[PDB]
Symmetry: C2
Subunit: 528 residues, 2 copies
């Protein structure tokens, strides 16, 4: 129930992110990220690296965004990576067909002149939107007499509009290509090299952190629907026989909201289950998929997503070379949105590329068995994760001035510690310099505050961009022995007074969750 307008104002004003090409009129679906935005984005990525790449010793690779057409024919993107599009017969404006129909039916279903059996007829139509093919969607548009929501004109019949950006590699026009819509295909194309790199042994995982592109018809959902975006994708290859994850018991005790395909079909709510129980009961198929669900859960929660607004939804059969797929979804002002996909596949692109190229993309276990690995595919939409953190950590202070802050965890806060000295004279610099060097030595990021106004107004700006902690250096710090300084907690605004030399280690422990603010207060004198 966040105030999106107010949050959006702060995000725009402090330049977390803003519309690309604003001065040229902007382009929808495209956003530039400013200094604090990049800081946060970079912390999210760094946290991801430690949590997955380093923790599982994943094989990292960096493939190109430019992709020649045949690669993407084989993966079936050329033929199937499209949204049905309908356009106005007169002026020619384009509309995403599925959404336009859904709006039209919801409109009619709200009418009082509309009958009960008619509404239940349209409710069932909504329950199949994604299944309908071209013809039957074309018929739905005629039957319900759908028009342009802007002008009211007749609409053209639905047509498949491929979502990949097209270009040409090299001169002439003989190598058509695309900007990649995902990074998984690069990992597949490199399967041999990666398997060799792993001494031919299985299991192993590979990852990419990079940009992919999706030429959306009409993005109007802020950061949620963009045409260019950074992904972090993992492809975990596993022998279908040895499909049990050794580290599963590290996450078996986690309690998280699971939303089964059955629960959705039967129409009951999501269940908070013990990860271990879910696997024993058959709800999660296996412990490899299970392990990653829990690891995804820990990552999202570590980076600022609220557990009470986080759930894992299994795909229905109708969504569909099928898969057992679970999406991490967060509760936002746009509703529940997927922020991390996690698919379990047996037959997939690796086999298509194999016969497409006549190059065997298989594993060999000695006795010499051909092993076509299964994959668990954790796919992280970094932009959406960040946007969710914004909505889940944005708060408004209790005051007339309506000051705001983000309760960003210390590991993602643009920086962990603001250092505000009351003066910058020669008497103060030895203390600031020392504090900065100590914070660096303790791996605590920081920035000297040189803004205007009272200490409280200065910290208010700091709070507005979500900086975790603050150290005030005043005249008593510089002039009284021993030299002590105020440590201020962002969330509570409560303050403490410790020796300037002790604070670096105190902030570090707070930032790393070794110590609570309460702990600090129990050990150090309170200060106002």
């Amino acid at each position: 129930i966040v105030d999106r307008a107010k949050m959006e104002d702060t995000l725009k004003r402090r330049f977390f992110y803003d519309q690309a090409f604003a001065i040229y009129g902007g382009v929808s679906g495209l956003y530039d990220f400013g200094p604090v935005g990049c800081a946060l984005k970079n912390n999210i990525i760094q946290t991801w690296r430690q949590h997955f790449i380093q923790e599982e010793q994943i094989l990292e690779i960096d493939c190109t965004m430019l992709t020649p057409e045949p690669v993407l024919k084989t993966s079936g993107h050329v033929d199937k990576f499209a949204d049905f599009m309908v356009k106005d017969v007169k002026n020619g404006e384009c509309f995403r067909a599925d959404h336009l129909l859904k709006a039209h039916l919801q409109k009619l279903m709200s009418d009082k002149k509309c009958s009960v059996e008619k509404k239940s007829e349209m409710e069932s139509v909504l329950a199949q939107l994604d299944n309908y093919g071209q013809q039957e969607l074309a018929d739905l548009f005629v039957n319900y007499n759908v028009k342009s929501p802007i002008t009211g004109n007749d609409l053209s019949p639905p047509v498949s509009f491929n979502l990949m950006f097209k270009t040409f590699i090299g001169p002439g026009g003989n190598m058509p290509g695309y900007l990649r819509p995902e990074t998984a295909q690069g990992i597949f194309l490199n399967f041999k090299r990666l398997l060799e790199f792993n001494q031919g042994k299985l299991p192993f995982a590979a990852a990419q952190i990079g940009n992919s592109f999706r030429n959306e018809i009409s993005p109007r959902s802020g950061l949620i629907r963009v045409r260019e975006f950074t992904m972090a994708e993992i492809e975990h290859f596993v022998d279908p026989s040895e499909k049990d994850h050794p580290k599963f018991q590290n996450v078996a005790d986690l309690h998280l909201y699971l939303y089964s395909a059955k629960a959705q079909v039967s129409g009951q709510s999501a269940r908070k289950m013990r990860l271990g129980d879910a696997v024993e009961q058959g709800v999660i198929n296996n412990t490899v998929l299970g392990y990653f669900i829990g690891r995804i859960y820990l990552y999202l929660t570590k980076v600022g997503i609220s557990p009470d607004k986080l759930r894992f939804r299994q795909h229905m059969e109708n969504e569909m070379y099928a898969c057992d797929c679970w999406d991490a979804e967060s509760k936002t002002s746009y509703g529940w949105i997927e922020i991390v996909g996690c698919a379990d596949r047996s037959c997939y692109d690796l086999s298509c590329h194999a016969r497409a190229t006549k190059v065997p993309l298989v594993a060999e276990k000695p006795y010499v068995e051909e092993v076509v690995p299964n994959v668990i595919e954790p796919s992280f939409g970094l932009g959406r994760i960040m946007y969710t953190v914004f909505e889940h950590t944005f708060h408004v202070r209790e005051g007339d001035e309506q000051r705001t802050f983000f309760s960003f965890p210390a590991v993602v806060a643009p920086f962990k510690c603001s250092v505000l000295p009351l003066s910058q004279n020669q008497e103060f610099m030895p203390f600031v310099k020392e504090l900065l060097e100590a914070l660096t030595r303790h791996g605590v990021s920081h920035k000297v505050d040189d803004s205007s106004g009272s200490i409280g107004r200065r910290y208010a700006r700091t709070d507005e961009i979500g900086v975790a902690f603050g150290v005030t250096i005043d005249f008593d710090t510089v002039n009284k022995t021993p030299h002590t300084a105020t440590l201020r907690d962002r969330d509570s605004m409560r303050q403490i007074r410790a020796e300037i030399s002790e604070l670096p280690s105190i902030v570090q422990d707070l930032a790393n969750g070794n110590i609570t603010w309460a702990d600090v207060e129990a050990r150090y004198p309170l200060f106002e």
Copy 2:
């Protein structure tokens, strides 16, 4: 004089980088980076961040790669970002015109039947290749009777081929666009936001680390000529009146090879000058440009480039809204190549975008003067920097087996320390675990070696990918009190024996240049 074939074999074999889409036949100009490649690439970027962004408190931003056409019309890329291209009249193959002519003239100039005055006529033609426009280049092709080097057929007249990848943003075809050829324009488009972010004050600098694209006609120079590549670009805005850099004296004492526009015109060699002297004598225009030259020098040299194969070349007037431009160039097997550009500009894109959009992109100094900033533009071609490091750090061991290694500095080595235990049993794990945790605590990256063969063969693999140090844990380490382990220096292969607990701090100091290998040897017992 590096053995490129041998280096290329190692680079390919250990999967630093390799041809993209190999299994589909490959695409020239495109390369995937494997695990060690990504490690090195990521270290280069991290080192860059500390050296520039953190050191100068640069304003970081992340703009989109997709760019709508008008943006790039204004910057003049649409009309002027092209190479003259000539194609075969029969089969239709394309050739970069400038290179084809240069090959043809060099061919004739090598002929013994060719006269002296004719050769000097062609030498002068080469001295103007870049200046020649379409018509006069077309005439040069007729006059010298240039044909296809493959078939020998007649060539079409030179035509301007724009190097930007074209696409369409959104549906229909009303928003044509391009993949950005550089990141500077994003910083210009965000000038207002960045200036505001900096409290309206000047100077300030902004940076992007990201990919840009250049649709090269025929790339055949490995990593040097690619169609997709990561850049790190800085745009340092400065008041033309206050064009003196406060920190200049930090780099004034550096001695580096400078290659003036005069030296090139007069035809004399590059000069090793003191940075300070160069500025006093007029060779470098000012200390802002000067400061960054020295900072570029320190960065390149820190990351592995050899000073004796590094020079800064000033642009000639003919290269040309002009500029005082200096390129960092490295000596490679492909000759001298630019790896970092550094342009000083007074009139540039900021003013074009201003009148294009009717949005004032100026600074205001109170008295209220309109300030149109100058810019120093350090532009880093990360791929080329990395390739140069490969050529400058690749060595071949003195042996029959022709073992190779990269002498990568510790800050860029894929990881700093290989840990090889002789066993992985329950008696050895407490020591390995402790060593790994200690190395982590000391910020020293590492990887347990689990490969086959003798200790020396194991380390040889480690050396081949340039890992800086090595710690052998053997039975004496686990069974004898006190518990000591071998520390091995990559370059020399010399070994030392210190207590397992002392080594973390010893490796850290080596890696951070606080201590020499010689120092270690003076303090600890030598071991073979």
